[PDB]
Amino acid sequence: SPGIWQLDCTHLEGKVILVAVHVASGYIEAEVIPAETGQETAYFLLKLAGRWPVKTVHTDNGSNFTSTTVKAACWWAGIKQMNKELKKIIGQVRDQAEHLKTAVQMAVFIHNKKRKYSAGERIVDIIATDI
Amino acid sequence: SPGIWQLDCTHLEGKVILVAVHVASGYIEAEVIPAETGQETAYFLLKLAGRWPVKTVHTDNGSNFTSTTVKAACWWAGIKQMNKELKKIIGQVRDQAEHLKTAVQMAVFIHNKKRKYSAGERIVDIIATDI
Numbered sequence: 328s329p330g331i332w333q334l335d336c337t338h339l340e341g342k343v344i345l346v347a348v349h350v351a352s353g354y355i356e357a358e359v360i361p362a363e364t365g366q367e368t369a370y371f372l373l374k375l376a377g378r379w380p381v382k383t384v385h386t387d388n389g390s391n392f393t394s395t396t397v398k399a400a401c402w403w404a405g406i407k408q409m410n411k412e413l414k415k416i417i418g419q420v421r422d423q424a425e426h427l428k429t430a431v432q433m434a435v436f437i438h439n440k441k442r443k444y445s446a447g448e449r450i451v452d453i454i455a456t457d458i
Numbered sequence: 459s460p461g462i463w464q465l466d467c468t469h470l471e472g473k474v475i476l477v478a479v480h481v482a483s484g485y486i487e488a489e490v491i492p493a494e495t496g497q498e499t500a501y502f503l504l505k506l507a508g509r510w511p512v513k514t515v516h517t518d519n520g521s522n523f524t525s526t527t528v529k530a531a532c533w534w535a536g537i538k539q540m541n542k543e544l545k546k547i548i549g550q551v552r553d554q555a556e557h558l559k560t561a562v563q564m565a566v567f568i569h570n571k572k573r574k575y576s577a578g579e580r581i582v583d584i585i586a587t588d589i
């Protein structure tokens with residue numbers, strides 16, 4: 328289904344990377360945050376919900392969505408309840424940037440634009456077709 | 459054209475709001491940043507470029523894109539060179555959130571989901587059709 332996203336945290340250079348994957352397309356969005364936190368999770372989900380039609384969200388760590396503040400965000404937005412590929416691309420471009428967050432955003436761009444249509448294309452098409 | 463975006467800063471409660479508008483749809487993305495800065499502008503544009511097919515970017519303050527670091531970002535991403543509506547929605551929801559950034563993201567969501575198809579729909583459709 329086009330409304331299903333996966334959301335997980337990974338660690339790199341002592342920082343946290345929140346990664347969201349649109350399961351049907353392989354499209355990703357990601358952000359660097361100081362540490363795993365219900366507030367960070369909540370605010371990311373607000374941002375995500377505001378650009379795409381997010382219906383459900385899965386994770387690999389159920390306890391991530393336990394906090395009151397994450398549930399409140401899912402309520403308001405009407406939400407219900409790739410590390411290796413991305414980590415790879417970050418290594419290739421890490422040299423070209425100072426900050427990890429910049430390398431993340433470069434990799435996310437590399438990821439979504441690559442062809443096999445690109446992930447970035449498939450999300451748009453899948454979502455348009457389902458309108 | 460579907461690759462044209464507008465990018466501007468506005469001020470509210472002594473903070474800065476970077477606002478991007480996809481001109482053909484009225485879709486917006488926005489972020490709260492400490493102060494107007496070439497680095498902030500640059501990093502936002504990386505993020506934007508990574509989710510949409512951004513071809514050109516306009517602004518109301520040409521000097522915003524003057525810095526070396528903003529030009530470098532446009533180069534790497536292959537980019538070339540609503541305050542009142544959004545400000546309104548922020549006032550309506552300001553009460554319901556502590557942080558300005560949360561109120562921004564709530565308003566951006568309100569904005570993109572409203573019907574007259576919604577802005578969020580029109581971006582997806584416009585971009586899908588042009589694939």
Ligand SMILES: Cc1sc(-c2ccccn2)c(C2=CCC(C)(C)CC2)c1[C@H](OC(C)(C)C)C(=O)O
Pocket residue numbers: 423424425426427429430496497498500501504526527530531534
């Ligand atoms: C802190 C800086 S300075 C800087 C830069 C690069 C070339 C010329 C001037 N500044 C950059 C870059 C801008 C273009 C790229 C492709 C996004 C990667 C490197 C950065 C970059 O951080 C920003 C994006 C917050 C500014 C970084 O982490 O290295």
Ligand SMILES: Cc1sc(-c2ccccn2)c(C2=CCC(C)(C)CC2)c1[C@H](OC(C)(C)C)C(=O)O
Pocket residue numbers: 365366367369370373395396399400403554555556557558560561
């Ligand atoms: C700092 C907090 S705590 C908190 C909250 C709300 C209800 C229950 C528990 N926490 C919230 C909210 C979560 C849901 C909404 C719809 C996004 C708005 C209010 C916030 C919110 O900041 C976050 C998003 C960084 C956590 C805020 O600025 O008020």
Ligand SMILES: [Mg+2]
Pocket residue numbers: 425426427428
């Ligand atoms: Mg750093």
Ligand SMILES: [Mg+2]
Pocket residue numbers: 556557558559
């Ligand atoms: Mg605040």
